[PDB]
Amino acid sequence: GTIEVISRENGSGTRGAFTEITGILKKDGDKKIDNTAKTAVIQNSTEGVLSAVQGNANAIGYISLGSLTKSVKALEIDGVKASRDTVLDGEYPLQRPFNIVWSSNLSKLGQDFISFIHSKQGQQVVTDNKFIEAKTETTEYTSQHLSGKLSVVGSTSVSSLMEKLAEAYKKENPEVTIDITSNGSSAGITAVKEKTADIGMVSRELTPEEGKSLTHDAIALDGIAVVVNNDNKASQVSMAELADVFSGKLTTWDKIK
Numbered sequence: 001g002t003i004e005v006i007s008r009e010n011g012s013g014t015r016g017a018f019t020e021i022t023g024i025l026k027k028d029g030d031k032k033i034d035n036t037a038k039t040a041v042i043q044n045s046t047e048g049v050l051s052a053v054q055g056n057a058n059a060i061g062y063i064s065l066g067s068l069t070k071s072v073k074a075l076e077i078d079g080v081k082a083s084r085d086t087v088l089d090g091e092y093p094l095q096r097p098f099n100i101v102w103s104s105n106l107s108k109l110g111q112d113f114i115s116f117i118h119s120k121q122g123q124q125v126v127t128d129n130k131f132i133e134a135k136t137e138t139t140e141y142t143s144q145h146l147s148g149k150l151s152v153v154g155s156t157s158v159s160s161l162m163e164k165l166a167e168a169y170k171k172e173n174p175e176v177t178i179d180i181t182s183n184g185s186s187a188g189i190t191a192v193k194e195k196t197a198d199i200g201m202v203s204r205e206l207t208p209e210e211g212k213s214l215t216h217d218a219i220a221l222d223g224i225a226v227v228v229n230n231d232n233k234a235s236q237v238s239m240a241e242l243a244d245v246f247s248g249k250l251t252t253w254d255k256i257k
């Protein structure tokens with residue numbers, strides 16, 4: 001039958017990542033065109049995508065990998081099954097890093113917060129919040145019961161996870177205030193360079209120009225699962241087919257072997 005493409009709402013960080021990685025979001029200069037199928041219906045959240053795909057035998061959608069449940073089926077992409085292991089070793093291609101960025105301006109307090117994020121406790125916040133931990137080496141954190149304010153600015157996609165990390169840190173450092181500003185990766189990089197943010201949040205690789213004078217560090221890997229209804233006999237798609245389906249070029253399930 002006819003493929004029912006489920007898209008996330010305009011401005012969604014997951015939509016931005018998905019369309020960029022699959023090449024559906026093309027730049028013909030400094031103007032980006034989102035080629036998402038014009039027939040695609042919209043869901044406003046991960047829960048909404050899950051409900052729509054579980055509720056319709058012909059539907060396909062995309063969600064954060066950590067949100068995958070038995071109520072839907074994740075497709076293999078290029079014959080690779082989405083998992084902690086295939087995201088970590090780079091076999092699974094629908095993934096993006098959650099980077100934090102800082103400069104030589106990073107305060108002692110900012111450095112203590114980075115140490116917490118790098119610690120066994122910090123890594124546990126990441127995995128408990130269902131993201132993948134890229135780091136294999138772990139350090140111990142002991143609170144200095146510091147005081148002061150931190151400004152963390154950038155990607156909306158990293159904001160929720162940053163909030164969880166700030167909560168766990170403030171439990172150990174009650175006199176530390178952490179402000180998290182969600183705007184975008186480019187605004188976060190600029191804020192760090194302009195010294196208006198202590199730490200920036202970037203949900204993609206930095207360009208050579210952006211990286212100048214900065215250090216970046218992946219605090220998490222965010223995989224994206226392409227999900228279908230459990231009734232769907234299809235189990236794998238190529239990256240070409242994936243882009244064809246979500247751009248509305250391939251519209252029937254019989255074309256997917």
Ligand SMILES: [Cl-]
Nearest residue numbers: 008009010042
């Ligand atoms: Cl929309």
